[PDB]
Amino acid sequence: ELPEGYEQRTTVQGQVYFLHTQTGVSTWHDPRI
Amino acid sequence: TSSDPGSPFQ
């Protein structure tokens, strides 16, 4: 589970990037971790 | 399904 604000986005690139734009979060790591 | 950033190769 995540804190609210993040969408679970996945690209054909084979990698997932967790986006939360309050403060523009673009990250490889799950933000709950 | 709404992103502003480009995807990283790192």
Side-chain angles (χ1 to χ4, degrees):
Chain A
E1 73 287 74
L2 308 310
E4 50 266 67
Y6 310 100
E7 59 176 81
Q8 197 285 273
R9 178 161 184 87
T10 308
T11 166
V12 284
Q13 181 65 329
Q15 314 181 90
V16 298
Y17 56 96
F18 278 123
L19 269 268
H20 161 258
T21 42
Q22 176 187 331
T23 53
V25 170
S26 45
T27 45
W28 285 124
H29 85 103
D30 186 288
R32 196 66 181 206
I33 55 175
Chain B
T1 317
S2 42
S3 47
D4 282 87
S7 45
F9 305 99
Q10 308 300 146

